[PDB]
A = this chain, B = another copy of it.
Amino acid sequence: LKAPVVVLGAGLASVSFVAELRQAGYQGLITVVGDEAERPYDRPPLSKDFMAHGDAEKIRLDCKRAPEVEWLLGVTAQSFDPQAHTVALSDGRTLPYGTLVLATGAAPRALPTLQGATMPVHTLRTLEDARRIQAGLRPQSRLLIVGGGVIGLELAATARTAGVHVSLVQTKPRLMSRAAPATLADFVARYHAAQGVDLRFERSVTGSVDGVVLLDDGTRIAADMVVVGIGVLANDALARAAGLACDDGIFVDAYGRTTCPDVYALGDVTRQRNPLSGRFERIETWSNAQNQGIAVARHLVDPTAPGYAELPWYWSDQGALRIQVAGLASGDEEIVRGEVSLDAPKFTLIELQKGRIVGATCVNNARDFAPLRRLLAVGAKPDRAALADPATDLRKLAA
């Protein structure tokens, strides 16, 4: 930890990191460069309550635990020189650094087949995106969502509740193909179909003409607006140009270190080790952005602190479904607690691998999720009969 600290990016990972530095005792200079001209804000409401109600002052991140920080908003870091220890800014200024932190997140992947489209096509990542989408979301408008990940499905539910007709195209045979158990994915499709979502599986967009989208099966979908959500790409251009190891994501170890001395990275921009799979992955969850940011800051101030160690998890709010998912999507068996029914959905899945818990899912059952995450964390091997037994209390069993 060499002063001054410069952080590139002012999203959740960045805010979490600078607040932990200050709370841990670092009182030297901290400067944050953020390219959006927005008071730092949280993204999950953009698909839900913001999209519906429209109040951005309900979604701002609390920067109060980060006193004495200069936030350069609406400014783009254009390059950094890791030998000179400087960053070049879009406003013509240069910042010196002792420690540089790359927290630049990721940007929506574009659909090449819609690149010359003459109809409204948006992605959903920023306040500006959400505001733009809202203003075309009239009741009985027709929305096409490309991509069956959580963002798209969250938007789908919000749109339907608002009286918008929703069609959704998914290339893979299942929704949430990333980091969701098949049982959950099948149920999620059943729910959305029941809410009026027109789901098209194993189809791809081949292009568009005069307000209609074309598909690989040779068919058409007319819509007033397309929202594309087919995943994101790490914002790692600065690192690539400066000579750091990247591959759609900056490689970091558990201390947030990149291959370049005095340069760290955290959050959506990173590829990091998933302790459960033992493989490097770009983890794009809210909890990772916050918790990896805190862990890296904590170790920078106190090098005896351990590195980042959390196992990955996320939630997704999709209408009546409060979904929570932790660990791996699959193992050698799945234990199902409760019934999988559209009639007041409430159930828990547990994935096991040689008797050890390696994954869990709760749907409208937040009470069981916390003890499942603790069990997950220690690689517990409970009695599978007790794990199926609805009489069992997971909170009790967790100690």
Contacts from A to B (Cβ < 8 Å) = 243-245, 247, 251-255, 257-261, 272-273, 278-280, 307
Contacts and interface: CB of A to CB of B under 8 A. Distances in A.
A81 to B, nearest CB: 13
Contact of A245 (B243, B261, B278, B280): B280
Given A243-B255, A245-B253, A245-B272, 17 more contacts: A243-B307, A244-B253, A245-B251, A245-B252, A245-B257, A245-B273, A245-B280, A247-B273, A247-B278, A247-B280, A251-B251, A251-B259, A252-B259, A253-B260, A255-B259, A257-B260, A257-B261
Contact of A259 (B247, B259, B278): B259
10 pairs of A and B residues whose beta carbons are closest in the complex: A253-B259, A247-B280, A245-B253, A257-B259, A251-B251, A261-B261, A245-B251, A247-B279, A243-B253, A259-B259
Nearest to A303: B83
Nearest to A258: B259
A251 B258 CA distance: 10
A378 B251 CA distance: 28
A304 B255 CA distance: 29
Contacts of A255: 243, 259
A253 B244 CA distance: 6
Contacts of A251: 245, 251, 259, 280
Contacts of A259: 251-253, 255, 257-259
A273 B244 CA distance: 11
A260 B255 CA distance: 10
Contacts of A261: 257, 261
Contact of A254 (B243, B254, B257, B278): B243
